Structure formats: structure tokens, C-alpha cells
Structure prediction request, 122 residues.
Amino acid sequence: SHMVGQLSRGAIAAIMQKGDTNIKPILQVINIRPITTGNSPPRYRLLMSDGLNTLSSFMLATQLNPLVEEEQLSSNCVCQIHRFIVNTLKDGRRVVILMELEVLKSAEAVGVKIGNPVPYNE
Ligand SMILES: O=C(O)CSc1nnc(-c2sc3ccccc3c2Cl)n1-c1ccccc1
Ligand SMILES: O=C(O)CSc1nnc(-c2sc3ccccc3c2Cl)n1-c1ccccc1
Prediction:
């Protein structure tokens, strides 16, 4: 019960504003899509939720591609992020690269979007 209490509420704002990387937040995957790479290996963009907010500017490190390609990491799964870095683009947007993560609960075991998160603004 209280499914939202499974997620690190407030982590998205903390990552995007304080830029603290010492945290190991538990987030839900809402959606995953490949992004166009020329002839580079595939790259995945994730829409993640901390229960309060969603954020669409997560990228998976390519070393984690098999998680997606063998379907252990998919929409609705709950993951703990163990290592990430934030990079800021020339235009001021920030991207969060997920380097290490652990799936705590598979999509099948969660089965739904937790809570009613709203998009994080900027
Ligand atoms: O529109 C789509 O379907 C793909 S989304 C997307 N595609 N390329 C990027 C870019 S552009 C760029 C330029 C310099 C360094 C990193 C990136 C990244 Cl990385 N993003 C991107 C931009 C902001 C947040 C997340 C991904
Ligand atoms: O795959 C991995 O194991 C790591 S992927 C990765 N790690 N740092 C980055 C960088 S360096 C950098 C410099 C300026 C603006 C954005 C970025 C980004 Cl962002 N990327 C990155 C570079 C190009 C495209 C997407 C991500």
C-alpha cells in the first residue's frame, strides 16, 4: 500500500537543482525509447518518475543497453540509481546519464504508473 512511498520523492528536483550525485534514488521507469544515432550503437532515453515529478532527460549509458534489450528494464519497473552524472548542454538544458542501476521490482511486479507525477519544469 502507499505505493508512492516506494519512490524517492523529490529526487528529481534535487538532481536537477542541487546536482548532488551522492544520492541513490529509487525511481520508476515510465517509458523508454531509442534515440536516433547515426551508426553509433543504440542509445536509450528514459522518462522517469520519483512519484512527484517526471523527467524525460535521462539517458542510459550504453553499457546498460542489454538491460533494455533483454527486457529486464521496461515501462513500470522500479530501479535504484547507483551512479549517474549530470551534463549541461550549451543551451542550458540538462541531461542525466544513468551509469549503474539496479532493478528492484520488475515491470510485471509493479504493473502501473505509481502516483500521479507531473512533468518537472526546466
Ligand atoms: O528527440 C529525440 O527523439 C531524441 S532526444 C535527444 N537526442 N539527442 C539528444 C542530445 S543532443 C546533444 C548535444 C551534446 C551533448 C549531448 C547531446 C544529447 Cl544527449 N537528446 C536529448 C536532449 C535533451 C535531453 C535528453 C536527450
Ligand atoms: O554511454 C556511456 O557509457 C556514457 S554516455 C555519456 N557520458 N557522458 C556524456 C556527455 S559528455 C557531454 C558534454 C557536454 C554536453 C553533454 C555531454 C554528455 Cl551527455 N555522454 C553522452 C555522449 C554523447 C551522447 C549521449 C551521452
